[PDB]
Design a protein around this motif. Structure first.
Motif, PDB file in Angstrom:
ATOM      1  N   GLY A  51       0.934  -1.251   0.023  1.00  0.00           N
ATOM      2  CA  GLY A  51      -0.081  -0.001   0.026  1.00  0.00           C
ATOM      3  C   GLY A  51       0.908   1.255   0.153  1.00  0.00           C
ATOM      4  N   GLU A  52       2.094   1.194  -0.188  1.00  0.00           N
ATOM      5  CA  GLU A  52       2.903   2.337  -0.194  1.00  0.00           C
ATOM      6  C   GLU A  52       2.789   3.195  -1.630  1.00  0.00           C
ATOM      7  OE1 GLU A  52       6.144   2.405   2.422  1.00  0.00           O
ATOM      8  OE2 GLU A  52       7.011   0.343   1.743  1.00  0.00           O
ATOM      9  N   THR A  53       2.835   4.456  -1.548  1.00  0.00           N
ATOM     10  CA  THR A  53       2.668   5.350  -2.521  1.00  0.00           C
ATOM     11  C   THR A  53       3.808   6.174  -2.791  1.00  0.00           C
ATOM     12  OG1 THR A  53       1.609   6.945  -1.270  1.00  0.00           O
ATOM     13  CG2 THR A  53       0.098   5.405  -1.872  1.00  0.00           C
ATOM     14  N   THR A  54       3.994   6.804  -3.918  1.00  0.00           N
ATOM     15  CA  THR A  54       4.842   7.603  -4.139  1.00  0.00           C
ATOM     16  C   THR A  54       4.047   9.035  -4.810  1.00  0.00           C
ATOM     17  OG1 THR A  54       6.952   8.356  -5.663  1.00  0.00           O
ATOM     18  CG2 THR A  54       5.424   6.906  -6.838  1.00  0.00           C
ATOM     19  N   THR A  55       4.792  10.262  -4.824  1.00  0.00           N
ATOM     20  CA  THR A  55       3.906  11.465  -5.250  1.00  0.00           C
ATOM     21  C   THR A  55       4.391  12.062  -6.701  1.00  0.00           C
ATOM     22  OG1 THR A  55       3.951  12.107  -2.890  1.00  0.00           O
ATOM     23  CG2 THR A  55       3.784  13.891  -4.627  1.00  0.00           C
ATOM     24  N   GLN A  56       3.450  12.134  -7.473  1.00  0.00           N
ATOM     25  CA  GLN A  56       3.703  12.753  -8.863  1.00  0.00           C
ATOM     26  C   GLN A  56       3.369  14.116  -8.947  1.00  0.00           C
ATOM     27  OE1 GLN A  56       0.662  10.975 -11.259  1.00  0.00           O
ATOM     28  NE2 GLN A  56      -0.937  12.211 -10.514  1.00  0.00           N
ATOM     29  N   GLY A  57       3.695  14.793  -9.907  1.00  0.00           N
ATOM     30  CA  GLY A  57       3.897  16.132 -10.131  1.00  0.00           C
ATOM     31  C   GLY A  57       5.016  16.745 -10.657  1.00  0.00           C
ATOM     32  N   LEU A  58       5.950  15.933 -11.152  1.00  0.00           N
ATOM     33  CA  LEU A  58       7.219  16.339 -11.887  1.00  0.00           C
ATOM     34  C   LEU A  58       6.997  16.766 -13.145  1.00  0.00           C
ATOM     35  CD1 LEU A  58       9.814  14.130 -10.198  1.00  0.00           C
ATOM     36  CD2 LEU A  58       9.712  16.543  -9.721  1.00  0.00           C
ATOM     37  N   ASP A  59       6.090  16.532 -13.943  1.00  0.00           N
ATOM     38  CA  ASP A  59       5.781  16.777 -15.442  1.00  0.00           C
ATOM     39  C   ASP A  59       5.510  18.389 -15.465  1.00  0.00           C
ATOM     40  OD1 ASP A  59       6.109  14.153 -16.037  1.00  0.00           O
ATOM     41  OD2 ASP A  59       4.282  14.108 -17.117  1.00  0.00           O
ATOM     42  N   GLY A  60       6.232  19.045 -16.341  1.00  0.00           N
ATOM     43  CA  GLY A  60       6.309  20.482 -16.646  1.00  0.00           C
ATOM     44  C   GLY A  60       6.371  21.233 -15.369  1.00  0.00           C
ATOM     45  N   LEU A  61       6.939  20.762 -14.321  1.00  0.00           N
ATOM     46  CA  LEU A  61       7.267  21.184 -13.167  1.00  0.00           C
ATOM     47  C   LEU A  61       8.121  22.582 -13.044  1.00  0.00           C
ATOM     48  CD1 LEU A  61       6.330  21.409 -10.279  1.00  0.00           C
ATOM     49  CD2 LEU A  61       8.411  20.081  -9.562  1.00  0.00           C
ATOM     50  N   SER A  62       8.970  22.542 -14.151  1.00  0.00           N
ATOM     51  CA  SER A  62       9.834  23.914 -14.396  1.00  0.00           C
ATOM     52  C   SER A  62       9.010  24.963 -14.726  1.00  0.00           C
ATOM     53  CB  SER A  62      10.872  23.409 -15.402  1.00  0.00           C
ATOM     54  OG  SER A  62      12.001  23.215 -14.960  1.00  0.00           O
TER      55      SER A  62
END
Lengths: 343, 343, 343, 343
Positions: free
Chosen positions: C119-130
């Motif tokens: 049930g462990e999760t990782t965080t997304q949001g690196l797409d186009g973060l610049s």
């Protein structure tokens, strides 16, 4: 950039030695028992542990008749065994070479506890390993053995233990390759506990992946190395029963997912299974329908010597009987390595 | 402990797709090109970059006659190509399936700079990749493509760049496998600079070892994956000349030292070499005396389409000529994949 | 070699922003909540989730009277909150700046499951973060928020989950620093389960060590960063009771063992504890006898807004009451940050 | 989960020893030199290398008068020095204890080459280190020193060398802590080459981050450890000149970015700089405006003994003169550690 750890001549020598060790039909006789390690085995008979008794037992293992020559491609010796001689005065390494085998030496200095881990251990023996390996090379030892001990528990093996064992195995491999000695990497996973075949396969895959990543990080020439992994088997306390075909499938699958094909051969260890069971499992592994790019040979300590020790009984009268038993077991294991062992 | 990332049914589906992609004699047509990526290719002719022009070019690539069917086992498409149709109204994925190929999609969203590195980049595209991969699966795409860009410089690739690319490739593989899509891992190493064959092989080994360690860490089912590495070749500025046999030996050696045999197949990328040179190098790789446990197929973007684009000229009159040129190149590359390409 | 990820001017700007955020007596108002995240909070009252309701609630949080100015050094906003205006027409970022605070933005795109983990999760949001971070910088956002979610289970957090979260946090920090935005690293550890204070401290130390190793690997300017870790507390199901002094000692010990002093400040998150309990624990942390080289401030989502939401009740009549309640809570938390909160 | 490597009593003992070593105004006299290491130093005078000469030199270092007592908090001894006695028959460890100092021992067995690296080395000495550390503990040695050698080259230090040195230092720390001995971690970076201050700082930050990540991975109690890093200085071949303030700022910045505050103190090594230069640089480091949570003391081998050796001249007549010179240098270094050294 790219600094060559080994010259092409060194790489060729290591590849030649490794291919000689795991040539088709040939395996490894693991006679790498310390004074205290063989003490328990000699106590199973009642014979006292002396230098002469150890010498005669290793002579019995090494001076077997001619039909054992194409079955044993390597013999791992203890430090004291490398410097003993047969009855006719021939040194044990020379006895091994005269039979076509490759002389090996156990270079690890045992396991030591890892702090903060649930009984996990790491292997020592890297101090002065370059000088020791060079001396072994001048004394006839062409490959080395390093037993890194891992077990399966509720939180074991941990990241620290796996990384430590992989790192120490990689350092030992680097030293051995620099000294012209083929390193046999043994990330042994103890079959202790109630873990099933699936968990053993998962842990074996993780351990082997970390081991080979460490080998890559240390610039280890994998063609000049051999792998000595545990057979992927259920724990000794596991109630669920697995057939030899299932064990072979799991072991070959774990090897194919982590071991690169550059490794010359995979020399399995007994790991506490009976002689017949170890031979049958090796035969099933070599009969696995999956494509196996490596020489799946045997490096058996107890699976080649248990019945030979039982037949010997510590007295010289059963010398021939123990020779015959060890020879028949070596023939069985060679047949298993070739995939045509039919009990 | 061991939490199965994929059920046995998911593993079987991924293995079946991967084996279909790299079945003997079959390779991959890397028709994936962004609007700006294919803009440069269409500007070599002088034809404007429009939706209709892109559609007709990809129809020309995908509507080849029956001789392409046993040569192309997979076609990588761009996002917009997956939703275009042929002249007869048949969707491009359905056109690919009707030819026996496997529909692929480029899921990476390009490379982004890595701070503190000498121009090194990491690939983005992990945001919402689960939903995108599921939609692609419902839309006919059975495998995905992820191009991770690495180059060779005086201090490049660094540890950060290699670890980053391996980690992102592993996350992409995990998402694709969870969505039933076979991930094609592409740790591409740019052939830019004066680096020789030896340094390219060393860097390729390091990159592939890190990539497969990351795949193991992310519990990637390697049988449900394919590898798309750069051919181990000297840099474009390298003055020293290497024969096709040397390049093949270096590439196969780098693959055997890092890639586990569980990987279904290795689908090489052109990487800026000519069509004939790429086909000859693939043939030499498949003719390498070293044992190759994987299907060494082709995943060529320009090595399959450069002559087809030149023959097409942007006008409908040369449709048949460009189709025939692409077909003959596909036949040549299939022969190279089977190892019997004789120009 | 050493390629400067940030010029000295960029480093100075990041350090200035970070020091402004965690200036003595000032903390962070974590007003960042998605449409569905704040939907549950507004459903606790019975008020429907609309754009106007969200705008008025965030105006109530942001347009508090003058005495809240030296207590709030930063305000984390959602994407839509950054582009809303107050009743007088002033944009919310301009309202924050006019009060001496620093405008923040939540840049992470939520958590996604990690395959093969419990049930462990990782965080997304690196797409186009610049591009997103650059736009936020032009819109007044000087720091960013990235919530990486970790939990404690019988085999959790695993090596894969910790390494993944550390890597993604490091990438987000690199992008934010390249765009002139101070990254607030949040390796949040969920207080879910029966784990005690000792295990929470151990897991926090492991997570923070991996996070800061990843930050070093990504060349993150730690003086231009802030840490938003979980308070080291026993699990919600833990039967054993720990005093505020024990929790503070464990938290400060975990921070001192892993966080380098270069980090400008540590802005604790509520993590599901009550408002008064969070303030008291922060005060105890700042009163810990151990030497604390960082500004131990607060970044509280619900520990600053629970009573304000309860007093507001979704109707405009309690606007002043909710302002006063939020102001008194912010004053209490500022006193706790200064170490002189005496309830 | 969390298996305590050390009980609270062991942690308390290690913290007490470490705080005693780096108590304010107290530093470390690095008197550990092998038979060949001190041979070069004694050859600079013209005095032969004998057991008696070594004993008298270490007695001169260790039997200084009362003004050394508040200036030297620890003395690192060689293996043979731990078992020698003063003129009055008092053992050297007992002489050190009677002066209020803490007895230290060099437990590393030198550096060995790392294959595939550009002359990089790793340190050995882990074989039987538990028994050796236990024996040293019974013999009065309360802390240990482990010198890991790193250098700066065009491609050096590599990832392999840094990871290897960090891993070996972490294993050494684990063994020493398990045996009740405070481990002094020395990831020394050689000031050899033309590298400038910026590159030295970058390499020091990378090395220290890897070292402390390895310490965290090995469950090292950082409060029971001390750090012995190289002063961040330009290379000896660097043409650009840096002031003492710049060197101090770079060193403190490198320490604050990597070293956690839990470390009891940072005991700098001379690293080939002159006695006066080392004292001035230590004073500048302790006068750096940046906040320093650790005791920035000295662990100087040559910076405390160069003038003492020169004054001694190998003859007993200058015993008092050499003792006075060593005493004055110890007072200067203690003042530098306190930040009020004014030459």
């Amino acid at each position: 950039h790219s600094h060559p750890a080994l010259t092409p001549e060194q790489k060729k020598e290591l590849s030649d030695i490794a291919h000689r060790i795991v040539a088709p039909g040939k395996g490894i006789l693991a006679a790498d028992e310390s004074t205290g390690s063989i003490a328990k085995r000699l106590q199973s008979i009642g014979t006292e542990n002396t230098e002469e008794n150890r010498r005669f037992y290793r002579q019995l293992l090494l001076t077997a008749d001619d039909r054992v020559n194409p079955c044993i491609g390597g013999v791992i010796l203890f430090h004291e065994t490398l410097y003993q001689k047969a009855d006719d005065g021939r040194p044990f390494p020379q006895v091994i070479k005269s039979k076509g085998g490759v002389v090996g030496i156990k270079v690890d200095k045992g396991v030591v506890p890892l702090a903060g881990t649930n009984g996990e251990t790491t292997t020592q023996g890297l101090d002065g390993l370059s000088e020791r390996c060079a001396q072994y090379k001048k004394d006839g030892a062409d490959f080395a053995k390093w037993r890194c001990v891992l077990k399966i528990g509720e939180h074991t093996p941990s990241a620290l233990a796996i990384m430590e064992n992989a790192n120490v195995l990689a350092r030992y491999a680097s030293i051995c390759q620099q000294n012209g000695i083929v390193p046999i990497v043994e990330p042994e996973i103890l079959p202790d506990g109630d873990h099933d075949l699936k968990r053993c396969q998962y842990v074996t895959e993780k351990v082997l992946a970390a081991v080979y990543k460490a080998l890559s990080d240390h610039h280890i020439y994998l063609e000049g190395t051999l792998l000595k992994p545990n057979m992927v088997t259920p724990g000794h306390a596991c109630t669920q029963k697995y057939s030899h075909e299932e064990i072979a499938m799991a072991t070959v699958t774990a090897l194919r997912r982590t071991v690169p094909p550059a490794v010359t051969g995979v020399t399995f260890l007994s790991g506490g299974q009976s002689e017949e069971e170890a031979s049958i499992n090796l035969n099933a592994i070599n009969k696995c329908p999956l494509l196996k790019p490596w020489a799946l040979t045997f490096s058996y300590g107890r699976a080649l010597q248990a019945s030979a020790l039982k037949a010997w009984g510590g007295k010289k009268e059963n010398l021939k009987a123990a020779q015959e038993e060890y020879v028949k077991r070596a023939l069985a294991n060679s047949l298993a390595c070739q995939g045509k062992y039919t009990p």
